[PDB]
Paper text:
To this end, we crystallized the D86V mutant. Consequently, the clinical D86V mutation of NLRP14 PYD apparently does not affect its three-dimensional structure in comparison to the wild-type protein. We should note that despite a large variation of chemical space, all wild-type and D86V crystals belonged to the hexagonal space group P63 with four molecules per asymmetric unit, resembling a dimer of dimers. The charge-bridging system is similarly broken as in the wild-type protein, suggesting that this mutant could undergo the conformational switching necessary for dimerization. Indeed, the D86V mutant showed a very similar dimerization tendency to that observed for the wild-type protein. Remarkably, however, the D86V mutant revealed a higher tendency towards aggregation, as indicated by the pronounced void peak. While the engineered L84R mutant showed remarkable properties such as a drastically improved thermal stability that correlates with a strictly monomeric six-α-helix structure, the naturally occurring D86V mutant behaved very much like the wild-type protein despite its severe physiological implications. This suggested that the mechanistic basis for the physiological role of the D86V mutation should relate to its interaction with other relevant components rather than an intrinsic change within the pyrin-domain structure. By contrast, the negative charge is significantly reduced in this potential interface of the D86V mutant. Still, we emphasize that the proposed docking model merely serves to illustrate a possible mechanism for how the D86V mutation can severely affect the interaction of NLRP14 PYD with other binding partner molecules, even if ASC should turn out not to be the physiological binding partner of NLRP14 PYD.
Author numbering:
A (entry chain B): 8 to 99
B (entry chain A): 6 to 93
Amino acid sequence: SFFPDFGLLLYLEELNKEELNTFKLFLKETMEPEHGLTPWNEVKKARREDLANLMKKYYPGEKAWSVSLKIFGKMNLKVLCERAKEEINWSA
Amino acid sequence: SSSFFPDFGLLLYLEELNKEELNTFKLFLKETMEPEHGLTPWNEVKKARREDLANLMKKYYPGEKAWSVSLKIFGKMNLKVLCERAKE
C-alpha cells in the first residue's frame, strides 16, 4: 500500500495548472455514479495534499490505485484527442 | 453496449502515437497480458502494426475489456512521462 500515501502526491505535484484541473474533472466524473456531486465542492477547491487524502477516503486500499491510473489514462487521451482534433481539422 | 473502442476509438489514438510511444504502449501491454496470456502472443504484438495491434486487442480483450486495459496502459504511459519530467 505505497500508492495512496506517497506515490499519488508526487505525480500530482508534477502536474501544472491546466493538468491539475483536468484531473479533478475526471475524478468528479468518476465519483458521480457513486457519490454524485456531493464531494465535488470539496474536490474542486482542494489542495494536492487534501486531494490525496480525499481519494484515500472515498477509495481506500488499491481502490485509489485503480481509479487514479484510469484518470491518468483519460488525461493522456484528452491531450491526444486535443492534438488529433487539430490534425483532422486545421480549423480546430 | 457502446465502447466500440477497438473498432472506432483505439485505431485513431494509436495513429496519434509516434514510434517510441507505440513501443512504450506495447511494453505495458506485455506486462498486462503476461499473467493472463504469458509471452505467447507477445511475439505478435511486438511486431504488430497499429492497425494489427487494434485487432489483437479486439481479439484477446473482447467487449469493454479493450477499453479498460487501454485506459490503464495510457495511465502508465502518462505516469512514465511525468516520472521522466520530475527526474529531469
